[PDB]
């Protein structure tokens, strides 16, 4: 509104602040990679979470993290509220392969207006608002100590989808197990599509993937939950995509009963 940017600014802030903590412990040569309540994981999920929530509970809206303390009746009157992962990919940090995310979306009757994925070790950022645009920006640590607002951050990145034509078809998977009906519809791809091939990416990576235009399709038939998705969702409707639910032309919906996510996948916007 007045409000909107500065609302998507303490997002993409949040996202930032929560990498930092993150990489903190992924960093630490103290850190003790085979441990719980004070294994890396649960700890940085902690100080993602806590740092997160330092600067979103000052906006008008709720909060409904994973790493968050509540029922359905207390939600399901918040016409407009953050979904938030602060540390996505669970695998990718324990193992150290590295792919993992921060995830904050605000969702409003249902639909992700706004997102921001951060991915820590490749310091790389994805914004969007709906009716501006996704982003991605490279290279970002933190924010300068002055003089930093959304339409500086917009300038500075890069609008999704970025240019590179090709001419084949490209499939984005898991780098974990993937379940037999995700395989089956790869399978089933790649019958369709002469020219194929299949690329990997850890977390909520795979979203962006197809908002940047680096792969045409991420079908996950798999369970996931809310807030894995809402915030790359939101990216890739700013860059020209959607996430359906799988087998339906209707997109993900939000603060629903149940926070999984049935089946979905991510492709362009269907005509
Ligand atoms: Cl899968």
Redesign the pocket.
Known sequence: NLYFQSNAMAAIDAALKAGEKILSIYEDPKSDFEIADNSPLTIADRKAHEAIVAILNETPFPVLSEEGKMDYAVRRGWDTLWIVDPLDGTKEFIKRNGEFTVNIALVQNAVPVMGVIYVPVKKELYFAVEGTGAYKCSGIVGLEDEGVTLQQMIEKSERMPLADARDHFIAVA?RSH??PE?ETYIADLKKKHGNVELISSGSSIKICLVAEGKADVYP???PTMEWDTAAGHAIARAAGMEVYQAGKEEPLRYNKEDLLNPWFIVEAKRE
């Open positions: 898991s993937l379940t995700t996950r038939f798999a």
